[PDB]
Amino acid sequence: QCQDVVQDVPNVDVQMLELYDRMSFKDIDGGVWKQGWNIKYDPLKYNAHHKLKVFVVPHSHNDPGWIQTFEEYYQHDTKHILSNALRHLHDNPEMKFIWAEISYFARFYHDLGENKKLQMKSIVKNGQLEFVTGGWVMPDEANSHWRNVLLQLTEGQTWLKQFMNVTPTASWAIAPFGHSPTMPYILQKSGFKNMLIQRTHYSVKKELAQQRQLEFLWRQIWDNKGDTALFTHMMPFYSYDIPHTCGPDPKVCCQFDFKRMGSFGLSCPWKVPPRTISDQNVAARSDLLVDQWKKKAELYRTNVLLIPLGDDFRFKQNTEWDVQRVNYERLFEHINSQAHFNVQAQFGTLQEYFDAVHQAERAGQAEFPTLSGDFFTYADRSDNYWSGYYTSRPYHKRMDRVLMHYVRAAEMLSAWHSWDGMARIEERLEQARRELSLFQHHDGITGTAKTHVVVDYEQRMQEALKACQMVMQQSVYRLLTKPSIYSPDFSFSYFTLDDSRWPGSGVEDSRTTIILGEDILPSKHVVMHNTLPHWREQLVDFYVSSPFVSVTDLANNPVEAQVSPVWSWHHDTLTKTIHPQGSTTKYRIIFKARVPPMGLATYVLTISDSKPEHTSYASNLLLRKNPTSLPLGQYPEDVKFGDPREISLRVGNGPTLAFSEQGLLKSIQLTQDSPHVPVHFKFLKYGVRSHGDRSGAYLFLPNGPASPVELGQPVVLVTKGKLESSVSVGLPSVVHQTIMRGGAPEIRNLVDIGSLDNTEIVMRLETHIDSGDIFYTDLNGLQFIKRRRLDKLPLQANYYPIPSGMFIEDANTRLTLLTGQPLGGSSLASGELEIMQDRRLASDDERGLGQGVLDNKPVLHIYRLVLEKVNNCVRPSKLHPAGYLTSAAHKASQSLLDPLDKFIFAENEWIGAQGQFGGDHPSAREDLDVSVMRRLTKSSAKTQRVGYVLHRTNLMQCGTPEEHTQKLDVCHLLPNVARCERTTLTFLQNLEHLDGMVAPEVCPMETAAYVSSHSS
């Protein structure tokens, strides 16, 4: 009974795209609630039989890196907050506290002595200290991939289950810069019942508050039935700090932040300090505070009110615990004893609030509206839209994607076996998962941390990449060596990884050359891994020390190969040009690897004395005035030269691409016969305002539409081969490359913004597609959501996250741009797509970072560009809020995010080598993925357990006849299965014991987790 995710438009009370269309966005002065109105209430609403029940929820926002590193904050702040929370909660049984960031809690609790560990477990068990969400971090929701949101959630909740014996079912997300429906998607499939959000556009807060729609059942945009719905509370005011959480008037609420009276170095900007509560003022102070509470309660439907009490790195000093607790206790004693207030107020936790709300709902006091959509792009005031962090620090945004994939591949490759503890597999994988998880923080992948904190994140992720490489190569050596020969040294490097696209050429000269020669080594084994659960072919390239190399498979069948030069681009400070130079001793060999589902395939590279029969050589043409020679050592084809001119290329049966004389795409012809469809790449620059608010790491505040980059007469390099052709051009700040391998082209930009201050570089595509004001962008790599460009909003409000792809279409034609990294983008006119490449900003943007963005470094951004005819596709109706990829665009996204992995055998001879692993793995239908495969038990467990997360996307149906494929039952991928269970996505709760030990496949747009148990 799968739900149809295409043809049924859900009926919801609030659909955010519709709301955006019909809503005004005027920024009017609301009074003391600057972005609201003067709230009025009827005092007679609450009375003896209907009291307002107020939960004051103490909290402390602890960033795992931002202006200090994780460890710096831990030593200077968080270890003291947690130590003093333990003490003060222990000593004050009615006090409560909620905690979100498990990275810090795990760091603290492991350093506690046993007596204090037991004390901590007691205040958790008795409900005083409550974990909210329980992720390793409170992640960004814009740039993060859903796989990594799940990874970090699982890392924190697995720790909490093991050590605290609790699993949160309420989420707390007070700080990400805008909010995504991927979160309720994952949380509802992970046992959650409630979630809270805060950072939404001030106009949205006003609109929803006017309708009492700040609490809603948030379902996915395609979900007609509502089974994805998760109850969500949106906070109504500008901040999560105490001045903006007691009620609408911050001048009043600041007087109830008792850390602000002076000795703590804090004050109230509204110039009225807090006063210590005493018997002689408690009636007056109570009157003021209850009036704020009753105004806040007017914005919600039940008689249960949430009052967060906290701020960043609060509840540190013992004196701060005392000043907040004793003054609130005095207020509660007075309020609760004076019947005319008709209030019962107490410290509470987040789960206590939600339980009481749903008790009111069950009592028939409220029904809640249904909502679908997202909450991007956030603006906290005026025109200050937070679309800059969709691009800031793009090197690390790209690195997140790379590490995402190597964590998946390392956990999958090593899951096939149990490993002795001496192999350190679990240690290395825990490290890798935790450093990637930490980077999902809303100051990590967002690019909003101080320079030295970004360096810490990068160093952590490099150690995680090294850890993944170690696990992967030990696993390949085990999976492909004859078992009676296998003799591992768990510290040795049997293989090294070769990655063509990270850090990427012009980024790092990291790539090892395979050194062959008659007097040293005639041949070398290489192995490709395919983490996807279907057979896959992909071209792979390696560097080799001779152009005379041929490829075989380990049945010694020849494999067709192409050798090309190794070209690198140089900014020549003497000629003031950007031009390529070729190596005269290293060459690139390219061939198609064919790899089993979730498997491995071995090939052999062999040198010979002359051109091998099954190896061809690319031609090379350098277009520039005033050329000079380009010798290439032993490469058998001389480079050709010419003046800049338009050129066209076609690889295989694929599209024909035409290029301008500046080396930029101008048109795509899909078929021999079909038209040249205009598709024009252009690079432009945005600047910064010379008056008013400045762009910085968070905010994008351009000084008008983008201006074209002046290109001069750039040098263009055309490489034409049977298997791979490309056009590369050295533009100012970007070496731009279009690569052809017979299908949709690959685009690579090596982006070096240099010392161009106050500049944002954008890549735009111009077409004739009649898209109007509509375009589609993805959310967290999970779903594509319809966007409408609104001219009532400024340019920066029409920018959205592009975490993995975007497209425009009309009745007949679609252009989809898939990315290998999250960046910001838009469609600012009909027929256009654009995506920001990097941004260098001299000023701070007044959101707390205290610096601009002047730490840029070269980054290789990767893309696929898919032009398609879509007039025969069955698409959603015009009212539906979602869009869906085609098969080719989905495969192109997978080619960027989860390419084949390439391993080079490190020693001269691999004794016992095998040619393949996984040839009998099922090759599953193209829309299904094994997103996670993770062994959950160490080797001493009698019953081994392996967890799998399956995800099925939804691809549009455009008339291509379906292949028979094989069903994938993950529970029988390993032998001796004894039990198969469906679980929450974190693997922490069993939901169903499955018949026959068979894990069913999932429906389109669904994600399920299974755990197989094996006797061992």
Ligand SMILES: CO[C@@H]1O[C@H](CO[C@H]2O[C@H](CO[C@H]3O[C@H](CO)[C@@H](O)[C@H](O)[C@@H]3O)[C@@H](O)[C@H](O)[C@@H]2O)[C@@H](O)[C@H](O[C@H]2O[C@H](CO)[C@@H](O)[C@H](O)[C@@H]2O[C@@H]2O[C@H](CO)[C@@H](O)[C@H](O)[C@H]2NC(C)=O)[C@@H]1O
């Ligand atoms: C010191 O200058 C003030 O800085 C404020 C930002 O610092 C405060 O918040 C940070 C937030 O840290 C979290 O959020 C960041 C992203 O911002 C994130 O990266 C972190 O992970 C973390 O989660 C916090 O660390 C720090 O302790 C501090 O609390 C900023 O909000 C202030 O702007 C207000 O005040 C300005 C005058 O001082 C004023 O010009 C601004 O317009 C803005 O005024 C507010 O405007 C709204 C809407 O009109 C009103 O409703 C508010 O009442 C009003 N507030 C005030 C005080 O007037 C400021 O820049």
Ligand SMILES: [Zn+2]
């Ligand atoms: Zn934060």
